[PDB]
Amino acid sequence: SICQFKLVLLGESAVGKSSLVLRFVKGQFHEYQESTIQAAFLTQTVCLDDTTVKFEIWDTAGQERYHSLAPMYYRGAQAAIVVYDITNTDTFARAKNWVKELQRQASPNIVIALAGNKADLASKRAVEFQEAQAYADDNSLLFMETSAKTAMNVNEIFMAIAKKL
Ligand SMILES: Nc1nc2c(ncn2[C@@H]2O[C@H](COP(=O)(O)OP(=O)(O)NP(=O)(O)O)[C@@H](O)[C@H]2O)c(=O)[nH]1
Ligand SMILES: [Mg+2]
């Protein structure tokens, strides 16, 4: 059996979208990753209990000037990962508005995950785990804290999404 899933990453600029995709797909992390100006397309293939799973992944430009283009990438998506930065409350608020947009405008069957990224920066935390967990539970979102830098929960969040599709 082979399954293929269409996935999109959304979120404020600098939260770590490209770093997360790069860690999952290439096992790489770049401390000096440049801001995305044009959406990038990547694939990874994994094994999941009796199935070979291929991911098709859109890594969007997070800056607000590219907002109007986002539906090109999420309208056909089966799953989305909305990413925020645990060290910045404003990015968590922005993530909630991405979630709201998906709920109103993307497929009614979309699986929405929420990633609290940069969790390795524990001494710089702004958003408490419990607050994000409660928001996720209330809105039916698949929530994990992640680190592209250390790889913490990077494999885990993509695999959890695949299990639910
Ligand atoms: N400490 C730490 N730094 C991280 C982590 N993930 C990304 N970064 C760093 O944060 C910066 C921004 O990451 P990047 O992936 O470019 O963010 P982005 O969400 O793709 N930005 P844009 O939307 O503008 O393309 C980079 O310097 C990157 O190395 C993480 O988990 N921990
Ligand atoms: Mg990027």
Give me the secondary-structure category. alpha/beta
Q: What fraction of residues sit in β-strands?
A: 25-35%
So how many helices? 5
Judging by the overall fold, what is the CATH architecture? 3-Layer(aba) Sandwich
Number of strands: 6
**Which molecules are bound besides the chains?**
phosphoaminophosphonic acid-guanylate ester, magnesium ion
Task: Predict the CATH topology.
Answer: Rossmann fold
Strand order of the largest sheet: 2-3-1-4-5-6
Instruction: Tell me the number of structural domains.
Output: 1
What multimeric state do the chains show? monomer
Query: Could you name the CATH class?
Result: Alpha Beta
Shape: globular
Modified residues (Phosphoserine): 68
Keywords: Cell membrane, Endosome, GTP-binding, Hydrolase, Lipoprotein, Magnesium, Membrane, Metal-binding, Nucleotide-binding, Phosphoprotein, Prenylation, Protein transport, Transport
Protein name: Ras-related protein Rab-5C
Binding site for GTP: 13-14, 16-19, 30-31, 36, 62, 117-118, 120, 148-149
What does it look like?
- Mg(2+) binds at residues 18, 36.
- Its cofactor is Mg(2+).
- This protein has one domain (1-165): Rossmann fold, CATH 3.40.50.300.
- The chain has helices at residues 17-26, 70-74, 89-105, 129-138, 154-163, and strands spanning 2-10, 40-48, 51-59, 79-85, 111-117, 142-145.
- The protein is of the alpha/beta class and 165 residues long.
- It has a six-stranded mixed sheet with strand order 2-3-1-4-5-6, sandwiched between helices.
- The chain is globular and about 45 Å long.
- 41% of the residues are buried.
- Helix 4 links the parallel strand 5 and strand 6.
- It contains five helices and six strands, in the order E-H-E-E-H-E-H-E-H-E-H.
- Bound molecules: phosphoaminophosphonic acid-guanylate ester (GNP) and magnesium ion (MG).
- Magnesium ion binds at residues 17-18, 36, 59.
